[PDB]
Design a protein around this ligand. Sequence first.
Ligand SMILES: CN(C)Cc1c[nH]c2c(CCCO)cccc12
Length: 121
Amino acid sequence: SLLEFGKMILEETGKLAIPSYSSYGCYCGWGGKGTPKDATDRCCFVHDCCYGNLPDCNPKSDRYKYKRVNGAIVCEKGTSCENRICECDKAAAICFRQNLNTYSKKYMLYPDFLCKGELKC
Ligand SMILES: CN(C)Cc1c[nH]c2c(CCCO)cccc12
């Protein structure tokens, strides 16, 4: 659920999900169109696509458990939807950490009309 995804992001990057990653670029947040603006936005695009592979799951409200083995994020065994949601979130969190160096505040509250073009998952 968003509760877990948020904690995961804070732990990884030191930034709070809202508002560092809730209105960033074209895909971090509501976002569903155009070309991702940068690497961080690409993390959100892939994350959206990952959720897209689970039509009968509810990633926003479905809660899962995960532990930290010294750095490493380890998804704990739950229902199959829970396990797959967790893997999607874990990947996004790592992708965010990996691209912290290029995160630009000029992409926060990014305008909708500038999200142009198209990209299939
Ligand atoms: C009520 N509320 C705050 C819902 C909400 C907060 N952050 C969200 C993200 C962020 C995911 C982008 O990385 C995606 C989809 C929904 C939400």
